[PDB]
Amino acid sequence: DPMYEQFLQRIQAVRTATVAKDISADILEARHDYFGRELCRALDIEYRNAVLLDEIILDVYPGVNLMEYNVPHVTPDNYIWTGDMLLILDYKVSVGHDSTEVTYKKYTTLILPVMQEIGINTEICIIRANPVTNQISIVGEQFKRLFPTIPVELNFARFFELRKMLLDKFADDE
Numbered sequence: 001d002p003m004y005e006q007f008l009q010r011i012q013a014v015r016t017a018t019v020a021k022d023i024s025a026d027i028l029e030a031r032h033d034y035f036g037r038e039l040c041r042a043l044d045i046e047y048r049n050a051v052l053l054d055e056i057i058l059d060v061y062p063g064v065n066l067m068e069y070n071v072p073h074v075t076p077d078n079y080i081w082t083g084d085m086l087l088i089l090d091y092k093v094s095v096g097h098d099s100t101e102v103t104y105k106k107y108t109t110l111i112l113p114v115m116q117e118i119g120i121n122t123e124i125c126i127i128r129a130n131p132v133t134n135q136i137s138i139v140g141e142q143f144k145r146l147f148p149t150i151p152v153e154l155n156f157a158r159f160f161e162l163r164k165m166l167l168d169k170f171a172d173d174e
């Protein structure tokens with residue numbers, strides 16, 4: 001894939017910490033996205049790369065009077081509308097829980113209040129893949145019920161080797 005080739009080329013070329021950090025960030029984003037794409041495929045849901053909350057409201061209630069509400073402009077990775085419930089979806093790729101809790105608290109306090117005012121039943125769902133062991137952990141009782149089985153086959157090895165190469169190249173930096 002040119003994904004890896006593009007990244008191998010920037011890593012080979014990079015000479016300073018500050019540009020390497022932007023490469024590091026872009027590796028983790030691509031790792032996140034590859035997870036989200038393989039998830040949405042296995043679950044047959046429309047893959048999206050962030051959706052503005054305002055877009056989400058307007059899809060589930062097109063007669064919304066957007067201007068009459070204070071809608072925080074958060075862009076979660078995706079969403080599912082069941083016709084009766086809204087599930088806000090965030091994909092994580094991580095060995096730890098830290099970012100799952102940060103995002104869970106952020107989306108709970110920023111999304112749910114306006115959806116409660118508008119009258120949309122709403123659940124914050126977060127799906128996390130461990131890059132090392134491939135195991136999937138799910139926040140979202142409604143998400144679990146609607147997707148008890150997740151038929152993804154993942155492989156994060158390219159991403160690990162790119163970031164291992166990047167951080168070997170800058171072992172004695174900061």
Ligand SMILES: [Mn+2]
Pocket residue numbers: 032077090091092
């Ligand atoms: Mn995410």
